[PDB]
Design a binder for this molecule. Structure first.
Ligand SMILES: NCCCCCC(=O)NCCCCCC(=O)O
Ligand SMILES: NCCCCCC(=O)NCCCCCC(=O)O
Lengths: 384, 384
């Protein structure tokens, strides 16, 4: 048993509706207005073939930039300097206002929602996860603090290998509806989380996508809101975004917080703009100045033992669902597999969004190229 | 084997991607921009509780209208007289720009796409279905003409009972992803259609949702477009709609043409406006004047033996995916279960959209109430 969860609609029974019940009352009043939450669905365009390249000023300093974007399978690229869009690129077949899957850049959005609730005093990071989700007793999340979840500092038997069919990541995907269920699989994400185990140690960085879904579960328990609604109320609805974002949901309606958000490049940049504005957005304060400052400051360097990340960023770290380079520019980034970045360059007051589709989830090859582009673009924004 | 189908994206292999392959190249470039087509997904609102009632002029003639709308579980109601919205109602919790499932009003949209292709000379209604879909040989659709599909005049062993778990409608739903698959179920909608049988007779009306999906299959074979794209290119993109529509898709990406479209009430009214404008929309001609005239003229009365429909509309009929009342006003309507109507009142140059969620799919009770409202509203628009 995973305890109380936010109803899909007001008054809904646990787990209702399902794929087999949404046409029945009382579910159908909700389902007929939200069918994409139940059944895969395609857009029928209201609008009746070539890449759009407006790389602007930075083009002079980076003449081959468009080629480098093509080489890294770039779908959308946008640079916001201050409040101004100063460079844009969209591949052939991808419109400026099309949405793109964020993968684990989604985690940085979830951390932001958690931060908002910390500012309200509804979450204390020092408290154990079980203070908010008692049902995680007996799991690897029995003992660790919420901050250790936020900082990915829990040792977990979870193989985060995105191409291994035997890995826990694929079981995670199957539990959440990203892959086809196997017999005996957990029924939903909450159940999957309760199955996770570890040796009990904490304090060393281990990237684990399950951690973010635990954060989303905590958000639900503290607010009583579906994570989908909490993500809107505490973040998205304050951005003055052009479009709604979307998030994949599992069979209970639980949003896939660790990887399942999609949005436009321009709208994602608004999240970066909020961070560089000390936590304030057009619709109000999203998180405290202190929270933003702690993100920019980084996590414990000694906890960060990931050789791949530190080979590129020796003084790098991770905190509050953000990767921190610890480089001379103080760059921090949300990062997702296949080449998604929400990259912050505080020195130039700039945000870089890059949304891509590398053939591979993550290799040193793509990592080197991607970071080379983001760093070069950042430096191109420097006063000369 | 069901033959050639439009690829989900340019160059895609048959049936690709699946739920298990969309993260792999080359599929992921497409999937990351269209994930809602693969995995159920929720909107994260960019906007930060009471019914909106603007029933306007007709309120004086129908003082109790709002109550009657509540009694029939109305979610959205809109009256367009000429080019002007003259009355609107939206229930608490449903915004004016929210989309709503159309159920079989979707069929009237599909018929419109077929009509466009007839005008282009790419479909001849007199030709057998097998002229366009040879793979339907050996099925109940081997022999009948395309027009007989359009007019629902084929005898089929298909129990269109929406609450019977043993009915062909539920098998249809399971094949298309509206319900959970059972072992041994057809893999997709195309396969399901090939399993249908009948005694071979034609000429009498039998409402069968499978007919519309055969029409959509024909559309795909003649255009080479996914039905989702054909619905946009030939109809939706010419309407100057406020929002995209959506349509549920099965595991091959085939749109559920018989029932799966969702859109806003105001945008649906644009379809009615196009019909009353002789087939022309803001973005160009959608169908010929002749096609519209034949819809308004009705089908063969003698074919219409459905006692429920004819008890209300004695001179009623059905043609080209529209229900024709044959009443003194010449009303014609798209109709969907649980209370969806795209209702045309040519006398007053008006369109009535009513989108609802009756607890039951279809009963004489709801039928009587729904039609009573539409007729009363139509008459309230008359010159006095
Ligand atoms: N299957 C659910 C998980 C989907 C999100 C995974 C993801 O995007 N992970 C990002 C890993 C970034 C690693 C950065 C680095 O090592 O340098
Ligand atoms: N399960 C797929 C079918 C969903 C659409 C069915 C539908 O909306 N049918 C409309 C029936 C209208 C009957 C009108 C009458 O008999 O008066």
């Amino acid at each position: 048993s995973t305890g109380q969860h936010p109803a899909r609609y007001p008054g809904a029974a646990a787990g209702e509706p399902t794929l087999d019940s949404w046409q029945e009352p009382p579910h159908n009043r909700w389902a007929f207005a939200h069918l994409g939450e139940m059944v895969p669905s395609a857009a029928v365009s209201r609008r009746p073939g070539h890449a759009l390249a407006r790389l602007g000023a930075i083009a002079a300093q980076l003449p081959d930039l468009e080629q480098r974007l093509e080489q890294t399978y770039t779908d959308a690229f946008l640079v916001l300097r201050g409040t101004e869009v100063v460079a844009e690129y969209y591949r052939a077949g991808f419109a400026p206002d099309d949405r793109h899957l964020l993968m684990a850049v989604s985690k940085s959005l979830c951390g932001t929602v958690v931060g908002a609730l910390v500012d309200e005093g509804r979450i204390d990071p020092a408290q154990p996860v079980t203070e908010y989700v008692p049902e995680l007793a007996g799991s690897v999340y029995d003992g660790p603090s919420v901050l250790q979840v936020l900082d990915m500092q829990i040792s977990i038997d979870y193989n985060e290998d995105y191409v291994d069919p035997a890995s826990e990541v694929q079981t995670h995907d199957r539990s959440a509806g990203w892959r086809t269920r196997r017999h005996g699989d957990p029924a939903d994400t909450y159940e999957f989380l309760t199955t996770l185990r570890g040796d009990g140690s904490t304090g060393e960085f281990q990237y684990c996508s399950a951690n973010t879904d635990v954060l989303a579960w905590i958000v639900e328990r503290v607010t009583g809101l579906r994570y989908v609604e909490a993500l809107s109320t505490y973040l998205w609805a304050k951005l003055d975004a052009d479009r709604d974002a979307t998030i994949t949901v599992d069979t209970t309606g639980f949003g896939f917080a660790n990887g399942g958000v999609s949005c436009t490049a321009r709208d994602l940049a608004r999240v970066g703009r909020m961070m560089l504005d000390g936590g304030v957005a057009p619709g109000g304060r999203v998180v405290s100045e202190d929270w933003v400052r702690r993100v920019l400051a980084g996590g414990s360097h000694e906890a960060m033992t990931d050789k791949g990340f530190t080979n590129t960023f020796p003084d790098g770290s991770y905190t509050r669902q953000w990767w921190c380079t610890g480089n001379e520019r103080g760059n921090v980034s949300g990062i997702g597999i296949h080449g998604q970045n929400l990259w912050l360059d505080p020195l130039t007051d700039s945000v870089i969004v890059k949304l891509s589709s590398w053939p591979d989830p993550y290799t040193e090859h793509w990592h080197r190229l991607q970071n080379g582009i983001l760093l070069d673009v950042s430096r191109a924004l420097d006063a000369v």
